[PDB]
Symmetry: C2
Subunit: 322 residues, 2 copies
Amino acid sequence: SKYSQDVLQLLYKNKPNYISGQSIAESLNISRTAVKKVIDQLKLEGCKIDSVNHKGHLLQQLPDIWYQGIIDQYTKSSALFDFSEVYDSIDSTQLAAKKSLVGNQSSFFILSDEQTKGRGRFNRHWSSSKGQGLWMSVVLRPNVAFSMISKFNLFIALGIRDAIQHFSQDEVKVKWPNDIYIDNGKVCGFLTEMVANNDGIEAIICGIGINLTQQLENFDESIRHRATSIQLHDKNKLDRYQFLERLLQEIEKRYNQFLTLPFSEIREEYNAASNIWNRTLLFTENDKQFKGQAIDLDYDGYLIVRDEAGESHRLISADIDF
Amino acid sequence: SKYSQDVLQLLYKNKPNYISGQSIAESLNISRTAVKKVIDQLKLEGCKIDSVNHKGHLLQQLPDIWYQGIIDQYTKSSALFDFSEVYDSIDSTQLAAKKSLVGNQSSFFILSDEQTKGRGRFNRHWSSSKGQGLWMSVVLRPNVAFSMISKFNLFIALGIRDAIQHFSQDEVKVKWPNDIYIDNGKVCGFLTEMVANNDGIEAIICGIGINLTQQLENFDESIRHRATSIQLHDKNKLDRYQFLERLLQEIEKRYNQFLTLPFSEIREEYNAASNIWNRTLLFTENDKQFKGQAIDLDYDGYLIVRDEAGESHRLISADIDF
């Protein structure tokens, strides 16, 4: 109902204390009894809320759904993000951000429980099941030249990897320049885009797709042997809000790094985190297609590739399969 | 009314022949008498239409207004443009295009008689008076790397200059990289932008502002000594449709050139068309500010600048006053 997010917001915020029906009713100027309906609704979509006589209500656990009212807390505390848009189902978080960034200078992100027209690179499909992943777009506003896009895409990768690492008991490796793996399982695809002209970047738009909670059973057979989810590498079980929280801080940490450090400062960390070395890779370029070894990452974010015919290459980007 | 554009479309198209009330009524399935109302309306907004008994109607001259129905003819005949959007008044053609390009691969342009929030570079104001200029945004879809933006901006300039040249009896010079002059009068500002990522350009968006019909009296005093309009350099008088027609062909010619030639092939033509040589210029860069001579344009579209302290510079872009 109209007041569902507001009740949630107050519950989230009053932790770890209990808030009464009464007090919620005063805050929102509604009846005690409309407050009980709201709370019954929430209990039923899987909010876990302790209700105790004489004391009131305590939100204990959220379900696998994004709620505007909760993420408004994230945006208020945040120095980087002006606001967020939260959706149940949408064509694409990325399409939505590209439309919202027009005509303002705000930094925001967009989340949706499901995408019905999720896209990765080169217009491939990106599977985005309801309840099962974080499907997010982030818009930011760095004052920098349009060349700097590639360097952005390097910092953000270490951020995303760190946030996933904190939750899997197995190793999380980056696959340059746009994917994150646990073993042979791709767990995130991410993608960075921009609007810019000669005078600079107007917005960076970063599309982040992370498998959260899928069982192997839940991926389509075409990708099932090469896909995984954070839940499949977590002992204790995985909360999407706590996850989102860590993800946002990592992004901010990595973003200020991007603003303030040369790529040389994180390069070594990046090599060490990467799973492209000492192994044979498939490169695709508009037609041509070749095997190659990754040799190195140069001071400026180029992959040095020892091609297969022995010719060397310097790539600011590529697309690679194992 | 509902049928105003359709009547116009049929009139434009049936040139140089006369079309009857009758025949227009059959085409659109409306009464002969609703057709006369439509034609009275048009005569009154300044369509000049010859009506002759027994023969019918001939559109002779359009007023200083954009009409969707006429520009739909432009788009149909055109191999480059999928469609156009025409507005009387709008915040910005550029904002509008950035919103329409999202989620499709169409090439189109947008026109508006007046902009209420016209922007040039660095967020400066761009004056866009009703009835007095072509305020257009063009979206295109070249398969090319994001570096190629600057080279695009070089070809399009020679196109815009040529279209204006065809109508002024005085010389039209380009001021690199974003403006067009007749004598000391800036007549167009143009601006090219993109949406892109590492893998290529998703769209080029070109904002073109051209003064058509203003009298010196019509520009604000702040810019009046450094602004001019095509009408002020034309003997015979200036028609915005014929103008738009030439502009579109020039853009297409220059765009295929951009797709198919190195910048070396048009460089000399570009130097010869430019009004930055043999004279003293003011450069602004985020703070710093310096005088300089333009020395040369290198094979790749960089301006070679002999700074004032004698240091040389290689600029892919700049902003310059005389």
